[PDB]
Design a binder for these strands. Structure first.
Ligand SMILES: C[As](C)(=O)[O-]
Ligand SMILES: [Zn+2]
Length: 180
DNA sequence: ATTTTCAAT
């Protein structure tokens, strides 16, 4: 039902903080939802969380999906909520995966942009977009959704941090400059 | 609690 382990609240709060230059976030958290659509069956859903170490989270996701999930005559609507955006090696692997598997649709929401000022990382993001992945920055609604779905929230509402929206606005500006 | 995004020389 749930792939991997949900986060405790302080881990989520730490890891999904969206200050563009945060220090000390060495992990990439990769939360996902997936709609599994097969013609003569009811639609089904899967959700979970991947972390680093097929080493990086993005590659762990691809390897699990191929080994456990991918089936003929099935369409997949996949959404990632990542704490960091991908490195160029991961981006290239995800892009080639998407080229190889036309029945997979990927939407990526990211809290932060990893090395957004580096051209190699910019190209990685571009190549993802060019293979049909939608790349977006997480806003309030996406943080709220992750809190509700991937965190042991103990029925407590999401508490947005100061600067959340301003950070979103800065990061989205950078993303659109990259994707342009 | 007017229940933590925004409230800004
Ligand atoms: C965001 As990464 C370093 O796991 O590709
Ligand atoms: Zn990577």
């Amino acid at each position: 039902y749930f792939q991997g382990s949900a986060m405790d609240p302080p881990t989520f709060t730490f890891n999904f903080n969206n200050e563009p230059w945060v220090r000390g976030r060495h992990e990439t958290y990769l939360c996902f939802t997936m709609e599994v659509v097969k013609h003569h069956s009811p639609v089904s859903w899967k959700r979970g969380v991947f972390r680093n170490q097929h080493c990086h989270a993005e590659r762990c996701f691809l390897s699990w999906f191929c080994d456990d999930i991918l089936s003929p005559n099935t369409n997949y609507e996949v959404t990632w909520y990542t704490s960091w955006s991908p490195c160029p090696e991961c981006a290239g692997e995800v892009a080639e995966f998407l080229a190889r598997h036309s029945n997979v649709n990927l939407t990526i929401f990211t809290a932060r942009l990893y090395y957004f000022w580096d051209t190699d990382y910019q190209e990685g993001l571009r190549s993802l977009s060019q293979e049909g992945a939608s790349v977006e920055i997480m806003g309030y609604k996406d943080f709220k959704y992750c809190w509700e779905n991937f965190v042991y929230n103990d029925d407590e509402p999401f508490k947005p941090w100061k600067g959340l929206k301003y950070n979103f606005l800065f990061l989205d500006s950078k993303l659109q400059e990259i994707l342009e």
